[PDB]
Amino acid sequence: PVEVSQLTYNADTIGNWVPPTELKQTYTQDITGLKPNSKFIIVPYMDRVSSEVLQKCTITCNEVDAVGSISYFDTSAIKCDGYISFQANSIGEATFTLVTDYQGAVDPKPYQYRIIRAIVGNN
Amino acid sequence: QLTYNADTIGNWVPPTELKQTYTQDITGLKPNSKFIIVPYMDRVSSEVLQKCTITCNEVDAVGSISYFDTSAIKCDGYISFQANSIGEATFTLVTDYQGAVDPKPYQYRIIRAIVGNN
């Protein structure tokens, strides 16, 4: 176990949300390979050319106690905001709900996420 | 035991010149505690290519943050740092904006692991 005086944050795990294939879509996505039963926070980041066709995406976890929503929007009024604080399950997984409303969706570029883990205790 | 607080948000002070290097102190933090600051965005693009890059002046801090609001959107990076004994941390901002009439600030979110005396 890591003493609080040696606490560090690992923030180098990044990934992509699978893009939708319809203009309005609700779906889920699993993230996998996490330390089992650890506490994490997932935050949005962006390095992404705007589609300029109003690609709105909201992510949440329907577990009570996974707290927060993440919002993405790429057209003029840029959103890359929110967070979700969650605990990975006993096999190192978590699931998220995505709700997308895109005004165009030919071959959309994924929105992007970063997972942060405090390395302290046995987390 | 371990929970995160991620609701502390703030603004980076905007530049007064087209090309600028300046510092900003974030204050009010728990003295000596360890944090990670990430960029976020909730902001109308200027469309005038407002580029901002941030690094931390504190001893042993690590990372860089980048912002860019025009076509190729950047809201990226992170800095992991320790607040000083006063509850402050100093950052260096490098800005290169193609226009700069009353610019909207770029935005940050500070994450703290609430564990032990952190």
Residue numbers in the entry:
A (entry chain B): 4 to 126
B (entry chain A): 9 to 126
Q: What did the original publication write about this model?
A:
A major factor that limits the expansion of shrimp cultures is, however, infectious diseases from viruses, such as P. vannamei nodavirus (PvNV) and M. rosenbergii nodavirus (MrNV), which have inflicted heavy economic losses. The Nodaviridae genome comprises two single-stranded positive-sense RNA that encode the capsid protein for viral capsid assembly, the RNA polymerase for RNA replication, and the B2 protein for host RNA interference suppressor. While the shell domains (S-domains) of PvNV and MrNV contain conserved sequences of 62% identity, the protrusion domains (P-domains) and N-arms show low sequence identities of only 17% and 43%, respectively. In this work, we have determined the cryo-EM structures of T = 3 and T = 1 PvNV-LPs at atomic resolution, the crystal structures of the P-domains of PvNV and MrNV (PvNVPd and MrNVPd), and the crystal structure of the S-domain of PvNV (ΔN-ARM-PvNVSd) in the T = 1 subviral particle (SVP).
As for the MrNvPd, three crystal forms (P3221, C2221, and P4332) were determined. The overall conformations and dimer interfaces in three crystal structures of MrNVPd are similar with a RMSD < 0.3 Å. Second, the structure of MrNVPd (P4332) reveals an additional metal-binding site involved coordinating with both oxygen atoms from the side-chain carboxyl groups of two Glu300 residues. On the basis of the environment of the crystal condition, it is likely to be a divalent metal, such as cadmium (Cd2+). These two glutamic-acid residues from one MrNVPd dimer are conserved in PvNVPd (Glu302). The side chains of the two Glu300 residues on turn β3/β4 of the MrNVPd dimer alter the conformation upon coordinating the Cd2+ ions. The distances for the Cd2+-ligand oxygens from the two Glu300 residues are ~2.4 Å. Finally, the initial difference map shows one outstanding electron density peak near residues Cys309 and Thr343, which is interpreted as one Cd2+ ion. This Cd2+ ion is coordinated to the sulfur atoms from the side chain of Cys309 residue, one sulfate molecule from the crystallization buffer, and a backbone carbonyl oxygen atom from the main chain carboxyl groups from residues Thr343.
